[model samples]
Target chain A: AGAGQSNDSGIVQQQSNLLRAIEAQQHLLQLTVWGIKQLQTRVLGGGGRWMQWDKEISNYTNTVYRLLEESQNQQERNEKDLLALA
Target chain B: AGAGQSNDSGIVQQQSNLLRAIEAQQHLLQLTVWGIKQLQTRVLGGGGRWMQWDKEISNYTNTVYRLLEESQNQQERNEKDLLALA
Candidate 1:
């Protein structure tokens, strides 16, 4: 019985751990977007416009968005997994 | 007894999920570094060099390293947590 309840307790603990991991990803995404914004503003803002830097920064932004969306999907899956376990 | 075994089952499942989440973060770090590399070589590679862009990118790389280390720490904590439950 001790082992059984421990198992239940561990399941809930694991769910919370998963949530925190998802949260961490979101925060990392925030850092990335902020860093990219600085590059766009300070570094790439000036000059007659090479457009190459501009284009690449734009691509970076796209990649960040994709990552953010994937994290969102993960969060959704986690929620569903937890509920199904219940 | 079924409940006891199911709890054991869930614990292992949860552990794997945690691992996959950590793996996802590592992959994200890979994408970020790769994108930053493009910004470095293709976009900011040429010209007189603003130094500002270079500095910011360096800073961005630092942020990534910090996040990666945090994920490593989380993995360690997860391992300990699992063991304590065991």
Candidate 2:
């Protein structure tokens, strides 16, 4: 309200900010998640000295797949979720 | 609840309310997400979309996305496919 800017800017900025925030969290999340190879190695006890970390991360990472599956299934159930509000 | 609202008023109200709610929610989300974005935006201007939304709106949008995704996945997942109880 101080200056002249597109009213849509606020909306866009708000959305842009949201988009960034979520993406960042997801990045950290995905990065924290071990790659498939790493997960396999951990479950197989191939991480050597880092096997514990790998295992820990793997346990957490396994949940990601399940979550992804659940989310995917949920998305299938509802159409409103696909509107891309953010 | 009011005794008499427009026929579509309830649905429209709900939707409008949802849109406003999501927008407001995202606004607050952006305020907090500055840290995450600052880190990445410093390196890259724009980032992913759903990631940030998921982080902030995960709690609110969890079931919502499920409902929506299911509805649109192929139009087969509908009211009958899910939600035995609301």
Candidate 3:
């Protein structure tokens, strides 16, 4: 019984580590998205004459933002799954 | 004088639209410093047991790659101060 408890503890610790990593990655994604948005706003302000690369930057920003959202959702699902087993 | 050659062609089309918006904000600051150095090399791989934010995402990815090298050295000193004031 003691060995089984030790194994369970190890699993929990492993899950904890995984969760931490996912969370950190998500945060970094958020920062990147924020930086892109800042640049977009500063360059394309008040909708004058759009530059050639405005659309490209906009598309990339949206893609990164969506990635961040998906990562957050996955992190939530992972936490729930881990809790269920824990 | 053709209106002084249309006022030097409207200041060279306003410095070619300010060098196309500083080359589209330096290609969106090189894609946000290559997505924060690809999420800090996939969360600091090959260095086991070094979690805890991994040096705060390696000092915010070297401060966004030194602000994209000072905005590419201020866009090469604003194209040599707009070609020595045109």
Candidate 4:
């Protein structure tokens, strides 16, 4: 039908898995963002002494960085893996 | 036409599915990282109790780890499913 559309078996099955993984990650990411927004509004903007807020902010920042790094690495790895399979 | 190849119409469709899934997950991961960064800078840095900070950090970290694990398992399962189909 299309270019490289020569009937190939097992394509659909693999495709399904990739799709599921993508959707699941998207859900997780969305929740993370929501949590961040909530934290910002409630804790930071809410307005308190800087001394009290510093520790919390630092901790939050560190954790965020960690998560971001991990996600980036994983995404890259998964992409390569998928390409290999495809 | 080639070795281990046949007129499999579903191959392309399946491949497309897998690609979509991968892309979706990638997006999710990026978003999660973004949220975590936002939380860290805006909320955690703003500061709160050491105890409270502990709880928040732990919760956020736990969630990140959980997502990572879940994504890994999902990817593996999908791959297996695809292979079996192929």
TM-score, model 4, chain B versus true chain B: 0.42
Query: What is model 1's interface RMSD?
Result: 5.7
Show what share of the native A-B interface contacts model 4 retains.
0.27
Please identify model 4 stretches exceeding 4 Å from their true place.
A1-9, A45-86, B1-10, B13-21, B24-28, B45-86
> Per-residue alpha-carbon lDDT of model 4 for B1-86, expressed as tens digits?
32223223233334333443444444444444544555566545665664575577668767767775676677567556656654
Candidate 3 Cα outliers beyond 4 Å, as residue runs: A45-86, B1-32, B35-57, B60-86
Per-residue alpha-carbon lDDT of model 2 for A1-86, expressed as tens digits?
A: 11112222232333333333333344445532323333345345555756676677779667766765675555444434323334
Please write out the lDDT profile of model 1 over residues B1-86, one tens digit for every residue.
Answer: 56745556565656676657666775775598568657756655653343554465456455545544564555555455545553
lDDT of each: 0.57, 0.40, 0.48, 0.49
Alpha-carbon error at B7 in model 4, in Å?
6.8
Q: State each model's TM-score restricted to chain B.
A: 0.46, 0.34, 0.32, 0.42
Model 1 misplacement above 4 A = A41-86, B1-4, B7-11, B37-86
List, in the given order, the native-contact fraction of each candidate.
Answer: 0.06, 0.00, 0.05, 0.27
Candidate 3 per-residue C-alpha lDDT over B1-86 given as tens digits, one digit per residue, 9 for 90 to 100: 45644553454445445445544544564576576445545543434323434455466545444544454454444344434332
lDDT of 3: 0.48
TM-score-better candidate, 1 vs 3: 1
Model 4's alpha-carbon lDDT is: 0.49
